[PDB]
Amino acid sequence: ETTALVCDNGSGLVKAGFAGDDAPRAVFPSIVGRPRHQGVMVGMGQKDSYVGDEAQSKRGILTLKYPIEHGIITNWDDMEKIWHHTFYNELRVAPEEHPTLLTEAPLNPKANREKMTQIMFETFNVPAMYVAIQAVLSLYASGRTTGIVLDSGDGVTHNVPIYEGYALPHAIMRLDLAGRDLTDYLMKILTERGYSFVTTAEREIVRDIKEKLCYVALDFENEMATAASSSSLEKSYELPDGQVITIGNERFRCPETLFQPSFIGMESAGIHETTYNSIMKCDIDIRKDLYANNVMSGGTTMYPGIADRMQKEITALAPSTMKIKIIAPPERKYSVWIGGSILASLSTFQQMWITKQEYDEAGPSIVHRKC
């Protein structure tokens, strides 16, 4: 009765569904495209915004905007179009009778979740609401209560170290390098062969390139010496207009900026010594249980060979007696949602919602106290 909704509204992809299930009912990209050309036929027009899946079948006449950049909602009029699309047009539910479980990255602005609270209560009129952290929900879905979670998505990657249900907020690190900064590095790195992708609708083609041909080399300075001696690493890809491109050493140079972020001009360290500098800011008694429970979540952690590369780079930093086990589940793209369906369908969680009656005695500043 009154099954809750779990809407993980990440950057780049929106995953929604019902609480208590094991798979999302709605996975569509988080874009709102508007037409940029001149309409000549009468009737084609009077429709100035395509949201989600029909803005990628009809791209090529649209300019595609992302409302969430770096985990922060930049466009508050286009984010209401995606929430209106994912309730009525995509899930086919009425939000007046279901409580929703939203999802936010750590270390975001406090006025980002202050306006998600205002929108769901004064526009969609949900009975109850709750805003959770991403990397705490990918420990629910992993069968653990202790561990350190590297959650690499599209806007941000962050580490949250948790020991026996107790989080250490002084050791939560956050990078703004993520998967969308590997798409924009692949557009620049492909111009050395002649292929120039420019437009916003041509960035979705080079995004589909990195999901199919890109991988992580276990030894980078050796792999660049065998990518030039022979041509056994090259693979071909067919564009939507029939042209065939050929990619050589740009298959592993694109996910290598997660481990060497000096390729994009960032001064920060890689993701292998960000997940280690946050272990070494935890207390000494719990470091043996974080080396062995190293949960990897999110979509950008799905390259072939990102687990065997990351075990190589923490064992070179950790002491030689610790064993290091990296937990990469096969379904780790939807791990943040599955732990959201676990938490919202819980028997002891049902007194932790922010009810609509509670929203009147406070303002939108109640979400900081209750979450």
Binding site: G17, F18, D21, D22, A23, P24, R25, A26, V27, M41, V42, G43, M44, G45, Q46, K47, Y88, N89, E90, L91, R92, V93, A94, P330, E331, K333, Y334
Partner: protein, 173 residues
């Protein structure tokens, strides 16, 4: 497509109409393969003037809901598809009368069945691809504003629309 096949025939007046039009268009799409009741081009013209008449009645059914909708920000997703139905039925009326008189003035050797009546299938499957978004944008406009005055007089509850919740997306592969 298969979205119309995922509905039930015991629905309201719009879903029983939108499922009749997909049964007409299913007779025309396999004419490219020749596995239907339409034998030659002279049945494709009579079927195209049938789907253009049924499509011209959902323009009338959709506009009664667009008049009872009180919010001006809600009809803009609905009137954008009622203007595409009004065009795609006007092409199917006139570009069937053209292919009727070409068949009489020239004979049977002029039109070749497949790859000659494909101007009638293309204008029909673009009507069907613009008629499932005026039963989806009309389902939103009749249940989001159900409690408003005027919409309840149409007698269209949310249980009358026979659309279900979608299927679970696959986790791997």
């Amino acid at each position: 497509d298969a979205e119309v096949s995922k509905w039930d025939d015991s629905g309201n007046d719009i879903i029983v109409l939108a499922k009749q039009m997909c049964m007409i268009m299913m007779e025309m799409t396999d004419f490219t393969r020749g596995k239907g009741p339409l034998k030659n081009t002279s049945d494709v013209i009579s079927a195209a003037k049938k789907i253009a008449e049924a499509g011209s009645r959902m323009d009338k059914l959709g506009r009664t809901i667009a008049d009872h909708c009180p919010d001006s920000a809600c009809k803009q997703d609905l009137l954008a598809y009622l203007q595409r139905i009004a065009l795609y039925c006007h092409q199917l009326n006139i570009c069937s009368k053209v292919k009727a008189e070409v068949q009489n003035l020239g004979g049977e050797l002029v039109v070749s069945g497949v790859d000659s009546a494909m101007s009638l299938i293309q204008a029909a499957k673009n009507l069907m691809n613009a008629v499932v978004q005026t039963v989806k944008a009309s389902y939103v406009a009749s249940t989001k504003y159900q409690k408003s005055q005027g919409m309840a007089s149409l007698n269209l509850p949310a249980v009358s629309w026979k659309m279900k919740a979608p299927e679970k997306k696959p986790l791997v592969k």
